[PDB]
Each structure stands twice: as C-alpha cells, then as structure tokens.
RNA sequence: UAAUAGCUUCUUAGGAGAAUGACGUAGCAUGCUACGC
RNA sequence: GCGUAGCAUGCUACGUCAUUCUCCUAAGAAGCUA
C-alpha cells in the first residue's frame, strides 16, 4: 500500500487541502480540493484492495507450494521404505528349496499356502495347554508337514525361556500358557 | 523437492530447467542466473509454464501468477502479480535466501559448451560446490555428445571370433578398444529390448570387426548397434576430503619383517599413514605400482581398496599384488556386464575381503582403512567425487604422474589444457607439490633417463642400471595414407620390417602408436601384441616398438612422448618424423 | 508453561530472566524481588520485552500490556495497562499468589557471587526450598566460572608425546590436571569446528604438556582448545527427608549371631532401624565405614546402596566389603567416561544387585531398603538432593565427620567455612548432635592418634595400639617451584628420595601431599603409589610419607593435615614446613 | 495397535451470495440563483 | 426561451467500510449408530 504512489497522491492531496484550509481559501477552491482528495483516497483504497488480493493469493500460493513440496518429500521416503522392505524380504528367501518347488510346477505357478509349508526353515508352534503339547511336539524332535523338526527353543506367553523338563503334567499350572516352540527343519 | 542452492547453499525449491543438470537455485541466485544468461525456464515444485487451455509460455520474466496458476500477460486474471520481481524469483523459503556474487562464473559454467580450452580452466578453479557441478555437467555433455554417432549393425554372420560392420552414412565413428563399448538393439518386429553388449575393434582389411563379447545370445541382422549413451548420476561428495593431519598413525598398525626389498620407503609409508590424504607423484618407472604393494606390506592387517580409472592400470596392480602380497585374501571386483576381458586369477568378486581391487566405475558403497587411488592423471573430477562418495576410509593415497597423458577429454578441441588443470589432485600436485616423490628411475637406459630428466623435469631422475644399448630412434619418412578417421603408417612398418631381421631380440614386442588406426592395422599383418599409448602408463615391458605417423602439435606433445618412451626397459625401435624429436634425445643412428 | 513459586509454592507463570537458574516466582514474590534488586527481566510464557518494530526495554515497571502484547512507554497501544503495579507483577494465577517474608534472603541468594563466606552460611540456614535453589545456583556459578579461563593454542611440536602450550594473553590460565577437559577449534578459514576432546598435564622440564586425546588428530599450529561447559540439571527432592521415629523396626530384620567382630555396634544397628535416617559422627579411623558393612551383616536381606562423593573413598569401601561381605552379590557403578580408574573386581555396572556401590554423581534411579551415604563432608547440598531424588529408600544412614576436609568450594576465597555449614547433614551433626557416636581409634598407632588428639579434637580420643616409633617428623626447608599453578617442592622430594633407600620397610608407603602437581610428578622420582589428601580420605594404607609442599593457608590447614596423617596404619613419615605445625605434634627426632 | 459408513454438535478459516446502514465518485431527472444571447 | 456556472432534492451504476443472515468448501475437537 505505502509502496505504491497512490499513497503519495493521497498524501500530497491531503497536505494541499490542509494548507489551503489553514490559509483561508475560497469555498470553490475548498470544494475543488475536497473533490481531488476524495478521488485520490478512492484510488488509494481501490489499489489497497488489489494489494489485499495480492497478499492473500500470495500466501495461499506459498502455503500450497509448501504443502506440495512436503507431500513430494514424504512420497520418496515411503517409496524407499517399501523398496527396502521388499528387498529384505527377497534376501530372506530360502532360494534353493523355493527354486526346487517352483521348477517342479508345470506352469511355474504354485499355491501360496504351500510356500512356507515346503520351504520355510523355521516352524513356530503355538500351544494353548499341556495335552496339545504332548500330542503335537512332545520330545526334542517331532513330525509336521511330512518333515522332521528339532526343537531349538521354547518360550512362554511372557517371552521367557522354558526348558523341556519344565513342561510336565504337574508343572503345567506354573507355566504361562500358551507356549511358543521354535523348531528348525532337520 | 527442496534442496540447497549451488552457489550459496541456502534452502530453496527452485531449479534452472534449461540447464542439462537442473541445479537447485535460491531466490536471489536464481534471479541473477535468469536475468543474465539465456536460461528463462525455472522449475519450482510445479513447472513455471502457462496453464491456459491454449498457450505455451516458458519464460519466467514474462510469467505472472494469478489465482492458483501462472499465466502470461494475455491470460492473467484481473489480479496481479509478477513471479520474478523485487530481485527474487517467487519460490519456497523466500526470506532465508542469501545472495552471492559468484553467479558471474556460474553463468560461464552453465552456459558454456566446453568447446574451448578456458571452460575447463575456469571449471576447476571455482569453489567446491561448483567444482562438483561443472564436472557433472561436463559428464552429461559428453554422454549426450555420444548420442550423435554413426549407429551400425553386423553385415551378416561372418566368424565366431569376428563380426562385420555396417554403419550409417553421414556420421563419425568412435575409437575402438576396451574403453568404448557398444550395444545391440533388438527392434526386430516386435519390441526393442537388449540382448548383450559387444565391444568392437578394426579388422584385417576392408570392413571387419574383431570383437569382445558380453552375452552368448547370437543375433541375426535384426539388431543394430548404438554407443550406450547411458545416464550420469548426480554427485554429492567433495572432490577432496579436507586435509587433517594426525599425530601418530591411527588405525594402521606397522608390521613385523615387512621386507628388505622396499625398506627405504618406511619414512614414506609412515607419511602416507600420517595425513588424511597423501599425494605421491613418481616419474615414469619409479615404483609407485610397487610402492602400493610396499604400503600394503607395511600395514599388514589393514583392508586396502585399490582403485584406478581404467582396467589396464588396475590389472597391472593386481598382477603385482599377486606376485608379492598374500594371494588368498585378495578380491578383484569385476563389472556384472563385463565390458572388458576381465581379470580372473584371484578369488574374484567378494567385497567383504581385505585387499579389494576395483575400478572407479564399479566401486560398491563400502568402507576401508586406506584406499589407494592410482593414475590420478587419467581420473576426472567425477571419478574423484565418486571415489569419495562410495568409499569412506581412514586414509586416502593418490599416486600418479601428471606428466603422463591426461584423460581423453573428447570435447576439448581448441587450445591446450595444461597439466595443472587436469583435475583437483593434479592442481594440488602442481600448486604446492606432491607430498612424496621418488626420483630414481628403475626402467630406462642411461642417456634416455638423463635426457628425460632434462627434457621437462627439473633434472631429478637417474637410473640404477646400465644402458642396454638396444634403444634407437630413426628418421624414416613413413608415407601417410590416413584414409580413415585416424592416421595410419603402414610403410613405416615396412621399414621396421626391413629392420627387425638383424635384431632378433624384440620378436615378442608390444606395438604402440599415437594413432589407434595404425595400432589396429599393426596387429593384422603381423601378430604383434599391441597396447596403445593411453593403455600404457602403469605397466612395464622389455620389448616395445613405437612409430610416429605424422608431424604436428599432437606429434610434439612432450607429455605423450614421456609416457611413450618410458614403458620399454631394454629395447625399443622407434620412428621419429621431426628433427625436433631426433635432437632432444641421444640414441644410435643405424 | 506454569510452575510453583520457589519461596511460597503458590501457582505462577513468571520467572526471573536475570537469575542464572531462572526460578519460578509468584506475582507478589516477583514484585518484591524485582522492585528491590537489580534484576529487571521477567519471563512469562512470552518474555516481557517490548514488542515494537525495534525496541529493547526489559525493565518491568516501564512496560504495559497493550493491545495483545507487552509494549514499552512510548510504543504502547493507546489503551494501557501497567504490568508491574498494584504491589504485584501481572502474570497467570494473579489473584491466588500469597507472598512471603523470604524475599529478603532470596535477594541475597540471587545477587551474591559466592565469593565471601557469609553467602554459604546464608545458603545453608535458610528454608528448605531455598536450600535447593541456593545449591542449584551455586553449581551454576561454579560451572560458569570455567567460561573465564584463557583460550589455549599450540606453540609447536618437537615431541608428539608432549604438546607445547600457549595461553591467550590477558586471561587467567586454568590448572592442568585430570578434572578439566578441552575441546578444540581450527578457526583459520576453514573449519571453526571442534577437533576432539583433549586433556592436559604439565611436564617437569621447560614448558611442555604431556597431553591426551580421545582421538588421534594432530594440531596444525592454528588449532587450539577451549574448556567446555557442564550444564547443571534442576533438582527437586528435599535435602533431608523428614524424620519419623518408629516404635519398632519396620522393613528390616535382625540376624542370628551376626559375628564376633561386630557385636559391639548392635545397639546402634537397632537405633538405625528405629529411625527414618541416622547420623554417625566419629573421628577418623574409629569404625565408621566399618559400621556400614557390619550393618549389612546385621540386615542380611536388606538391599543396600552405598554412596559417596569421591571415587577413592567408595573404592576403599568396596575393598572392605570384598573383605567382609559375600563378593557374589556386589556391584560397582561407574560413569560413562570414567575419568578415574575405578574398582574392577565385582560384576561391574549391575544396578539390580543386592549391595550396590556408586558415586553420588553416577547414581541411577532405583530403590533400596537402606542407603548408606559416606563421607558427608565431601558432599554439598546438591549431592544430598541428588541421592535423595534418585534413590528411594526405607532407611537412610549418613556416616562421616565434619573435622575432615570439606568439599572443594573453588569459588570461596574470603574467610573460612565453619564445619556446621558444610551441608545440612553436618549442620545437623553439629547443632543437636549425632545419633550414633564412636570415639576410639582402631586403625592408627598410639603416637599419631595421640598427636591428632591435640590438633583437631580437644583431647577426646583414647585409642588402641602401641606407638611403634615409626612416626617421623622431618625438618627440611623445601624450596618452592610454583610450576603447574599448584606448587612443586623438588628438594623435599629429593629428601624423600635420598631417604627412601635408607628405609627397607618403607618401599611401599603411599606418597601424600596437598598439591596435586608434586603428588603427580613424584611418580617418576620414587615410583610409589601417589595420592592427594582430598582423595586419600576414607582409605587406609600400611605406611604413609606426607610432604608439606609449601607454607600457605591450604597446606597448613589443620583439617587437611589431620585427615592426611590419620591414614597410616603402623607408621608415617612426614616432612613439615610450618615451625608451629611441626611443633604441635610429638614425633621422633631425625 | 486402532476398520467402513451414516448422522449430529461445537470451533476456526476461506470464498460466494443476500439484507441493512455509512462514505466517496460518475451518470440521469427536478427546483432556485448569477452572467451572456 | 437557450447556453455556462453554483446550491438543494431524488433515482441508477461503481468502489470502500460496519453489522446481520444464508450457503459452499477446508481444517480441528467430540458424540451416537450399524
Ligand atoms: N627397492 C627396489 N630396489 C630395486 N628396484 C626396485 C625397488 N622397488 C621397485 N623397483 C623396480 O622399479 C620398477 C618400478 O616400476 P613399476 O613397478 O611398474 O612402478 P612404477 O611404474 O610406478 O614405477 C619395478 O620394475 C621394480 O623392479
Ligand atoms: N570391632 C573392631 N575390632 C577390631 N578392629 C576394628 C573394629 N572396627 C574397626 N576396626 C578396624 O578399624 C578400622 C576402621 O576403618 P574405617 O571404618 O574405614 O575408619 P573410617 O570410617 O574412619 O575411615 C578398620 O580398618 C578396621 O580394621
Ligand atoms: Mg606405478
Ligand atoms: Mg571411613
Ligand atoms: Zn541455467
Ligand atoms: Zn543462492
Ligand atoms: Zn498464455
Ligand atoms: Zn532474579
Ligand atoms: Zn511467591
Ligand atoms: Zn518500546
């Protein structure tokens, strides 16, 4: 507003009007200067309206630009995170067993539900009570999915280590069921 | 995306879209770049174009934004305002942008086309964040320049070891060696894809190629060859990490019974282990290839990454480290595409080993204890920034002689780039001097080594040998044919075969030439193993023959002469054309 | 961001900007503090500066709350109103702030520079909240005094093991010992960035410092050092938890025939069990820290945390516990840097062990059943608040004596501090008396105790040994070399060296001297274990050589000399300076 | 760790519209007065 | 009677400001239901 010369025109018109009023100018000159001051102030506020629109749309454009830059610098982060997750999952794969079962496929296509069941090297058995434990994986080795597994660890629901001697019929009340047993393919 | 301005490092979100590299630019810096040069396109988080139904205005000094878009003057709303005003270009972080008056050289960096000599000389003395940008845009310019080339194909199936060449008409053809590789395109009917890369080399006569293959997939005529104008990634690491000294050697623990072979360099080994980065310039044939092995034997338990610009130097270093260093804890890292006949003698390609040898282009992002860069004359600033980005190590050692030949530097055609501005490291070696320098030359005869020390050097070289009395220098005319992109001297080989019968020594010689066409034709009529003047500089030989084809400023380049005549050890037949080149040196007349 | 007033614990949102610790103050208390002292800056949720375009007015009586911000006298919006008026200062919770009469001691605490002695006797006899605030601001002032130490630099390096030093001209030079560290600069053009953490110590010959670093960077001559700063954390817990007298032992359990050696202190163990906290005051070497281990043997199931202000005292306590307690259930907690070499014989740094020994500063937040603070003379109110905050407990036992040497108090340089103002615990001991008191020396021979019952204690101690006649008092002038800003007495060390080969049974006597410089430099010339008087407290040795370095008010301190001599177990040779001090004791001839 | 969808309350901001009032400018209509024909 | 100038009254258009209301959108807090 003050940068534009409309303020300068308003200020010089007001100064001339005040000077002539103090100097006792005639009524016709007084009305002439009043009209000139009125049109100068009219131009001043009219361009101040354009300045209001300028600053408003400039702030809106700046906020939009900040938001777009933020949403574009947050897209690259999630793209990199997804890429790292996918490549780590690639590196986790049991490549030889998966290659065997996928070359045995006629079309190259296999059900997903058999991918762990035939290639996973580690089995987690979650057991709710002692009778189930005795049924499924009693002893240090057991059979599941037509394979042989050897118990490598047992933990309780509290993620505390449990020894195979502590899983008994009388020590069952003292164990935080369920028990998660981790076994490796033999 | 936001980033840092190139010449003031303030936060910004603009970009000079007309530039090849599109560098970030702060507000005041972007205004100073656009009002001065002819780049009038600026890319913000959205491109600064005219978002009208029909109109296409790219200039930014003639764009006014309104509402939520940018239009020209014929499509703007009743509201204002200029995008490019008050000394600034409207972008993010408008009041954190500090101007800088180093745009007066950023204009010359961004707008030049590298045709003249001065572009390199002012693309190397600028600041660091412009040292990187100039190298990046130079590499981009070279890559785009290799896109205007004489695409070819194979005429028809001709041999299992050799193909033929059917080029297009009206376009130049590249040099042919292991450096220039070529790509086949399978646009057959049906879906252009890649089958494999072949490198090419001139044939015996007429039109033929004796090649080097990448993939076994044998094409019909359905493929045509281009020159793999690949992409250039941006570079971020500085050319040279800051020089910080250490009191006593850190992370490097000296050895027991290193050898009685190289025990005179123990002071230089420890001076290598002292600073952050060290510089060793050794005149041709003074043991820098052997100094690397000695350094590896002076700090026995430190993993060392050897690196070089080209396969020849790194392969010679690999062979020496096989001959001296322990062998099983070695690992040469080969490219997956295998554009060269690579080196398979070690337990190859295990990046988690101790002595890791590699090329600059194929370095994997890893860490080391002390990394030895070799042939810094060959390396451009891009290679230095790459080796600083991919490799983090406690010590860096740059070895190489700036008096040898520079990089190809294909774009340069007018004027001579003096050695000082080959790269940052050669500038260091000429400004203050190499930190280490070994001046006793162990390859050349007496007269040649004394005269080479008196040719350009400030008389600092000598030989621990006697002169073998089998180096010569003749003046035989050697009529020129030159009916190919380079000059050839066949009847000079005629004169040399008029000799070479009373001289049974060199009958296993390596042929060198100042022109790749004569080098290619010299391996055809007589099967001399060849090695170009560029492919030298890092290996030693005892039988080498070198002829001069022409007489010009490319024939009197004393850097090339010094890198040529210092690869033989006991015998060289050589052809001199100019009386200048017969009189700076002492040899028998015949 | 609201809080509680320091001296009335009303609700508030104001803080004093000029105060180092920036304490919360209610409206009435803040008005009383600012209208009387020179502090004239008040921080609310927003600071009370004047919000003109540019104006800097901070005095609160000048300002007004005008419009929506704080404005000065001739920048205010025409609508007022005054901030600092109506007997208050405008802040949150304005009509709930009850003042006090402690705005006469708080002015003195905030204003004082801790130079005189009366500041400490007013910082320890005030109310409980002021006891914490005064300790906090005292630690803050002790830390900010280090900011006035001269910036260093390096002269050169002839020897890489001994740095050369150069202090800035016109500033004081800090003392060279282990307690002070430094961090560097390289401000040339070119890296105004730190270059590592170093530390210094003087050399005997010429001007040199045999430095030490955390890394192995060398200093190009422009690189230099500045002493860093330790920010002081806020503290909340009371200095002493209020005492309650139980009818019977709660939370603790006796034992079955504790031992035949600890059978005398059973009544004091029961008294400890009865009360919330207990104080044990006794002359040195009477059974105070051998009372705590007996207490552990009397309450076997009780988890116990032993703590002390020093490291060499808690180390002696650890050794005694190893001699008595089961070694399996012990620990030792060390700080991350571990400036001193600590005790490594138990399972170090396991907080959840039954008996846990640590310094006050490195205490981890945990619980216990009784916490044993030892050598409360070394501890200030900050240490008491720290141990009362981090370690919850059921019973507290403070063992120590006021007549030993107090905490350093580096800022104090005028007058002397009486024992009853060392901290709150010593004040309790001297005012009403200790809860447990045992005067009978069980460690030192008859001669040294019969002399120390004349220096410090007014003929109170009988003791138990026989004077072995190996108590020696030497006459030697001892010329002065004020070298490291702590004196070194080379000829006295020479006297010792010339008469330590004449004493075949004194080859292992510990060397004690008040000055750390001579104490550290003696290691080369005689090779004995060395120890300063301040850290020797709490540890016993079979033989002691004490050397009064120079006559001063530091080495002729009766408390220091009494805590120095009484570490002997069978004999002690001491060389003295003061004609009075050598005469007040009754030792052998020489 | 926290789903899909519907409805409702409250608060803030922006735009558009409406209504009323106020000021200023321009255009048009009327009454009175001064000068010239 | 006409032209020029001035004052007063009225209507329309435009610009600015104050108040009230409606709606359209965005953002946030919350409640209930299936
Ligand atoms: N200590 C030494 N004594 C004698 N000859 C040496 C010694 N060290 C190196 N040399 C010889 O110097 C020559 C150096 O050439 P090279 O090993 O290719 O490295 P460069 O090309 O960097 O000089 C070698 O041929 C080697 O035989
Ligand atoms: N009941 C006792 N019987 C025999 N000797 C004791 C007895 N109590 C303590 N002592 C001896 O007295 C010394 C006192 O040591 P300490 O308690 O550390 O003294 P201080 O607490 O003053 O440092 C111990 O070294 C111990 O050998
Ligand atoms: Mg070499
Ligand atoms: Mg004790
Ligand atoms: Zn540009
Ligand atoms: Zn900039
Ligand atoms: Zn347009
Ligand atoms: Zn204050
Ligand atoms: Zn208060
Ligand atoms: Zn003001």
Alpha-carbon span B535 to B523, nearest angstrom? 15
Strands C64-66 and C42-43: unpaired
Alpha-carbon span B168 to B151, nearest angstrom? 6
CA distance C151 to chain B (A): 21
Residue B189 makes CB contacts below 8 A (sequence gap 6+) with none
Does the beta carbon of B549 lie inside 6 Å of ligand 1?
no
Alpha-carbon span C38 to C43, nearest angstrom? 15
Length of chain C: 590
Q: Per-residue DSSP letters for C428-454?
A: HHHHT--SEE---BSSS-HHHHHHHHH
Cβ–Cβ contact A170 with B under 8 A? no
Q: Which residues 9-38 in chain A have a CB closer than 7 A to strand D?
A: 34-35, 38
3-state secondary structure C326-359: CCCCCCCECCCCCCCCCCCCCCCCCCCCCEEEEE
Sign of CA dihedral B576, B580, B583, B584: negative
Alpha-carbon span C456 to C20, nearest angstrom? 38
Of chain A, the end-to-end C-alpha distance in Å amounts to 83
Cα C74 to ligand 8 centroid, rounded to whole Å: 26
C75 CA – D17 C1', rounded, Å: 42
Of chain C, the end-to-end C-alpha distance in Å amounts to 71
Helix (H) or strand (E) holding C562: helix C558-565
Alpha-carbon span B164 to B35, nearest angstrom? 53
Residue A103 makes CB contacts below 8 A (sequence gap 6+) with none
Alpha-carbon span B303 to B306, nearest angstrom? 10
In chain C, what is the greatest distance between 2 CA atoms, to the nearest angstrom?
92
- Taking a C-beta distance cutoff of 8 angstroms, is the pair C168, C224 a contact? no
Question: B13 and A76 in contact by Cβ < 8 A?
Answer: no
Of the residues B261, B285, B287, which should be mutated to test ligand 1's pocket, given the most ligand atoms within 8 Å of the CB?
B287
Determine the CATH number of domain A98-185. 3.30.70.3540
Evaluate if the CB of A56 falls below 7 Å from strand D.
Answer: yes
Name the residue at shortest CA distance from atom 3 of ligand 2. C261
Q: What is the DSSP letter of B530?
A: B
3-state secondary structure B418-469: CHHHCCHHHHHHHHCCCCECCCEECCCCHHHHHHHHHHCCCCCCEECCCCCC
Alpha-carbon span A124 to B364, nearest angstrom? 37
C560 CA – D21 C1', rounded, Å: 91
Touching B (3+ Cβ pairs <8 A), the chains are A, C
Q: Which of B1, B66, B90 sits opposite A73 (nearest CB)?
A: B1
Beta bridge partners of B184: B225
Q: Which nucleotide is nearest to A52 (CA to C1')?
A: E16
- Taking a C-beta distance cutoff of 8 angstroms, is the pair C388, C239 a contact? yes
C371: exposed, middle or buried (C-beta count within 10 Å: 0-12, 13-18, 19+)?
buried
Q: Nearest CA to B197 among B158, B164, B166, B225?
A: B225
What is the Cα A68 distance to its own chain's centre? 15
Cβ–Cβ contact B95 with A under 8 A? no
Q: Determine the protein residue whose CA lies at the shortest distance from the C1' of D25.
A: A39
Quickly count: other Cβ atoms within 10 Å of residue B374's Cβ.
26
CA distances from B485 to A125, B224, B227, B576 (A): 74, 22, 17, 22
- Taking a C-beta distance cutoff of 8 angstroms, is the pair B299, B270 a contact? no
CA distances from A146 to A117, A143, A183 (A): 9, 6, 14
Please name the method used to determine this structure.
cryo-EM
Residue B109 makes CB contacts below 8 A (sequence gap 6+) with B122, B123, B126, B130, B133, B134, B137
Q: How many helices (H) and strands (E) does chain C have?
A: 15, 26
Pull the structure tokens for residue C524: 């080369």
CA distances from C507 to C462, C524, C530, C542, C569 (A): 30, 14, 13, 11, 15
Resolution (Å units):
2.9
Alpha-carbon span A90 to A84, nearest angstrom? 10
Sign of CA dihedral A44, A45, A46, A51: positive
Quickly count: other Cβ atoms within 10 Å of residue A41's Cβ.
15
Quickly count: other Cβ atoms within 10 Å of residue B520's Cβ.
23
Residue linked to tokens 């003031």: B8
Residue C491 sits in which domain range? 446-584
Pull the structure tokens for residue C283: 């002359």
Residue B200 makes CB contacts below 8 A (sequence gap 6+) with B163, B165, B176, B180, B182, B209, B211, B225
Using only C-alpha atoms, what is the Rg of chain A? 42
Helix (H) or strand (E) holding B356: strand B355-359
Quickly count: other Cβ atoms within 10 Å of residue B271's Cβ.
15
Q: Which nucleotide is nearest to A36 (CA to C1')?
A: D25
Residue A107 makes CB contacts below 8 A (sequence gap 6+) with none
Quickly count: other Cβ atoms within 10 Å of residue B218's Cβ.
10
**Ramachandran assignment for B206, one of left (phi > 0), alpha (psi -120 to 50 degrees), beta (any other):** left
What is the Cα C155 distance to its own chain's centre? 35
CB-proximal positions of chain D, under 7 Å: 14-15, 24-26
Beta bridge partners of C545: C511, C573
Alpha-carbon span B491 to B547, nearest angstrom? 11
Of chain B, the end-to-end C-alpha distance in Å amounts to 71
Does the beta carbon of B566 lie inside 6 Å of ligand 1?
no
- Taking a C-beta distance cutoff of 8 angstroms, is the pair C536, C564 a contact? yes
Pull the structure tokens for residue B533: 């003047």
B458: exposed, middle or buried (C-beta count within 10 Å: 0-12, 13-18, 19+)?
exposed
Alpha-carbon span B535 to C359, nearest angstrom? 68
In degrees and rounded to multiples of 5, residue B309 shows phi and psi of -75, -40
Q: What is the dihedral of CA A21, A25, A28, A32, to 10 degrees?
A: -50
- Taking a C-beta distance cutoff of 8 angstroms, is the pair B329, B350 a contact? no
Pull the structure tokens for residue B117: 């000599």
Alpha-carbon span B310 to B406, nearest angstrom? 12
Q: Nearest CA to B280 among B407, B438, B427, B449?
A: B438
Pull the structure tokens for residue B534: 């560029």
Helix (H) or strand (E) holding B510: strand B510-512
Q: Which of C191, C215, C218 sits opposite B245 (nearest CB)?
A: C218
Pull the structure tokens for residue A31: 């009305």
Alpha-carbon span C511 to C503, nearest angstrom? 14
Q: Nearest CA to C345 among C316, C322, C317, C312?
A: C322
Alpha-carbon span A64 to A73, nearest angstrom? 14
Helix spans in C37-154 (H): 105-111, 118-122, 128-144
Does the beta carbon of B290 lie inside 6 Å of ligand 1?
yes
3-state secondary structure C3-46: EECCCCCCEECEEECCCCCCCEECHHHHHHHHHHCCCCCEECCC
Beta bridge partners of C82: C64
The C-alpha angle B355, B360, B364, rounded to 5 degrees, equals 65
Alpha-carbon span C328 to C316, nearest angstrom? 18
Sign of CA dihedral C395, C399, C402, C406: negative
Residue linked to tokens 């008096």: B403
Beta bridge partners of C474: C575
Alpha-carbon span C65 to C88, nearest angstrom? 14
CATH code assigned at C516:
3.40.50.300
Strands C11-12 and C3-4: antiparallel
Which residues of chain B does A57 touch, with a Cβ-Cβ cutoff of 8 Å? 65-67, 79
Quickly count: other Cβ atoms within 10 Å of residue C41's Cβ.
17
Helix (H) or strand (E) holding A130: helix A130-137
Alpha-carbon span B313 to B70, nearest angstrom? 55
Ligand number nearest to the C-alpha of B62? 7
Which residues of chain B does A53 touch, with a Cβ-Cβ cutoff of 8 Å? 79
Cα C436 to ligand 5 centroid, rounded to whole Å: 86
Give chain C's contact residues with B (Cβ, < 8 Å): 157, 160, 191, 195, 215-218, 220
A49 CA – E19 C1', rounded, Å: 21
- Taking a C-beta distance cutoff of 8 angstroms, is the pair B572, B559 a contact? no
CA distance C154 to chain B (A): 13
**In a 3-state reduction of DSSP, which class is residue B206?**
coil
- Taking a C-beta distance cutoff of 8 angstroms, is the pair C239, C128 a contact? yes
Evaluate if the CB of A63 falls below 7 Å from strand D.
Answer: no
Which atom, in ligand 2's list, is nearest to the CA of C317? 18
Is chain A adjacent to chain C, meaning 3+ CB pairs within 8 angstroms?
no
Question: B79 and A53 in contact by Cβ < 8 A?
Answer: yes
Q: Nearest CA to B100 among B37, B39, B25, B173?
A: B25
B112-119: which pairs have CB atoms within 8 A and are 24 or more residues apart? Answer: B113/B141, B113/B411, B114/B138, B114/B141, B114/B411, B114/B412, B115/B411, B115/B412, B115/B413, B115/B414, B116/B414, B116/B415, B117/B412, B117/B414, B117/B415, B117/B416, B117/B417, B118/B415
CB-proximal positions of chain E, under 7 Å: 6-7, 15-17
Pull the structure tokens for residue C67: 């419009």
Question: C217 and B242 in contact by Cβ < 8 A?
Answer: no
Cis peptide before A178 (omega within 30 of 0): yes
Residue linked to tokens 């104008």: B229
Alpha-carbon span B7 to C18, nearest angstrom? 42
The C-alpha angle B92, B98, B103, rounded to 5 degrees, equals 105
B377: exposed, middle or buried (C-beta count within 10 Å: 0-12, 13-18, 19+)?
buried
Q: Which nucleotide is nearest to A41 (CA to C1')?
A: D24
CA distance B362 to chain A (A): 21
**In a 3-state reduction of DSSP, which class is residue B497?**
helix
Evaluate if the CB of A99 falls below 7 Å from strand D.
Answer: no
- Taking a C-beta distance cutoff of 8 angstroms, is the pair C480, C487 a contact? yes
Buried b (16+ CB within 10 A) or exposed e, C209-244: bebebeeebbbeeebbbbbeeeebeebebbbbeeee
Q: Which nucleotide is nearest to A43 (CA to C1')?
A: E15
> Which of A3, A4, A57 is most worth mutating to test chain B (most B CB atoms within 10 A of its CB)?
A57
């Amino acid at each position: 507003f003050s940068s534009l010369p409309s303020y300068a025109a308003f200020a010089t018109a007001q100064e001339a009007y005040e000077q002539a009023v103090a100097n006792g100018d005639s009524e016709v000159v007084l009305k002439k200067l009043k009209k000139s001051l009125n049109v100068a102030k009219s131009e001043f506020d009219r361009d101040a309206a354009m300045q209001r629109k300028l600053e408003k749309m400039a702030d809106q454009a700046m906020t939009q630009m900040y938001k777009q830059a933020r949403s574009e610098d947050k897209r690259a982060k999630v793209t990199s995170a997804m890429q790292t997750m996918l490549f780590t999952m690639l590196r986790k794969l049991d490549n030889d067993a998966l290659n065997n079962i996928i070359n045995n496929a006629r079309d190259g296509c296999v059900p997903l539900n058999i991918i762990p069941l035939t290639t996973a090297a580690k089995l987690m058995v979650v057991i709710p009570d002692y009778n189930t434990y005795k049924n499924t994986c009693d002893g240090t080795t057991f059979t599941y999915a037509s394979a042989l597994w050897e118990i490598q660890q047992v933990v309780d629901a509290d993620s505390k280590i449990v020894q195979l001697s502590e899983i008994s019929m009388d020590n069952s009340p003292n164990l935080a069921w369920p028990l998660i047993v981790t076994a490796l393919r033999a | 995306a936001v980033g840092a301005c190139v010449l003031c490092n303030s936060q910004t979100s603009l970009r000079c879209g007309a530039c090849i590299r599109r560098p970030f630019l702060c507000c005041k810096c972007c205004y100073d770049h656009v009002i001065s040069t002819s780049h009038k396109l600026v890319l913000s988080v959205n491109p600064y174009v005219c978002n009208a139904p029909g109109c296409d205005v790219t200039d930014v000094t003639q764009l006014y934004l309104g509402g939520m878009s940018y239009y020209c003057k014929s499509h703007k709303p009743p509201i204002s305002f200029p995008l490019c005003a008050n000394g600034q270009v409207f972008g993010l972080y408008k009041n954190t942008c500090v101007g800088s008056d180093n745009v007066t050289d950023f204009n010359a960096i961004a707008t030049c086309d590298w045709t003249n000599a001065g572009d390199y000389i002012l693309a190397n003395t600028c600041t660091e964040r412009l040292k990187l940008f100039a190298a990046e845009t130079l590499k981009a310019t070279e890559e785009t320049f290799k896109l205007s080339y004489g695409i070819a194909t194979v005429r028809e199936v001709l041999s299992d070891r050799e193909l033929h060449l059917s080029w297009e008409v009206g376009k130049p053809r590249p040099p042919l060696n292991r450096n220039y590789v070529f790509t086949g395109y399978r646009v057959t009917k049906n879906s252009k894809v890649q089958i494999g890369e072949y490198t090419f080399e001139k044939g015996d006569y007429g039109d033929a190629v004796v090649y080097r293959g990448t993939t076994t997939y044998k094409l019909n005529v359905g493929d045509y060859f281009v020159l793999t104008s690949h992409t250039v990634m941006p570079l971020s690491a500085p050319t040279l990490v800051p020089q910080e000294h250490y009191v006593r050697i850190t992370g490097l623990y000296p050895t027991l019974n290193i050898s009685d072979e190289f025990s005179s360099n123990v002071a230089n080994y420890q001076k290598v282990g002292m600073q952050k980065y060290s510089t060793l310039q050794g005149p041709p044939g003074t043991g820098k290839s052997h100094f690397a092995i000695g350094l590896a034997l002076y700090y026995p338990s430190a993993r060392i990454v050897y690196t070089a610009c080209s396969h020849a130097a790194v392969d010679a270093l690999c062979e020496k480290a096989l001959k001296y260093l322990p062998i099983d804890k070695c690992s040469r890292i080969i490219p997956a595409r295998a554009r060269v006949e690579c080196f398979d003698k070690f337990k190859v390609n295990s990046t988690l080993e101790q002595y890791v040898f590699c090329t600059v282009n194929a370095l994997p992002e890893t860490t080391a204890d002390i990394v030895v860069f070799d042939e810094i004359s060959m390396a451009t600033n891009y290679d230095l920034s790459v080796v600083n980005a991919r490799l983090r190590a406690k010590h860096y050692v740059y070895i190489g002689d700036p008096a040898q030949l520079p990089a190809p530097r294909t774009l340069l055609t007018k004027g001579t780039l003096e050695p000082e501005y080959f790269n940052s490291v050669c500038r260091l070696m000429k400004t203050i001097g190499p930190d280490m320098f070994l001046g006793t030359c162990r390859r050349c005869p007496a007269e040649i080594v004394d005269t080479v020390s008196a040719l350009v050097y400030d008389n600092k070289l000598k030989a621990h040998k006697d002169k073998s009395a089998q180096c010569f220098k003749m003046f035989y005319k050697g009529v020129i044919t030159h009916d190919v992109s380079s000059a050839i001297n066949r009847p000079q080989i005629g004169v040399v075969r008029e000799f070479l019968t009373r001289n049974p020594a060199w009958r296993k010689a390596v042929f060198i030439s100042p022109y790749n066409s004569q080098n290619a034709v010299a391996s055809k009529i007589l099967g001399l193993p060849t090695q170009t003047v560029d492919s030298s500089q890092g290996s030693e030989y005892d039988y080498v023959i070198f002829t001069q084809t022409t007489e010009t400023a490319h024939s009197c380049n004393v850097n090339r002469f010094n890198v040529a005549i210092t690869r033989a050890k006991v015998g060289i037949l050589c052809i001199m054309s100019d009386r200048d080149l017969y009189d700076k040196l002492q040899f028998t007349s015949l």
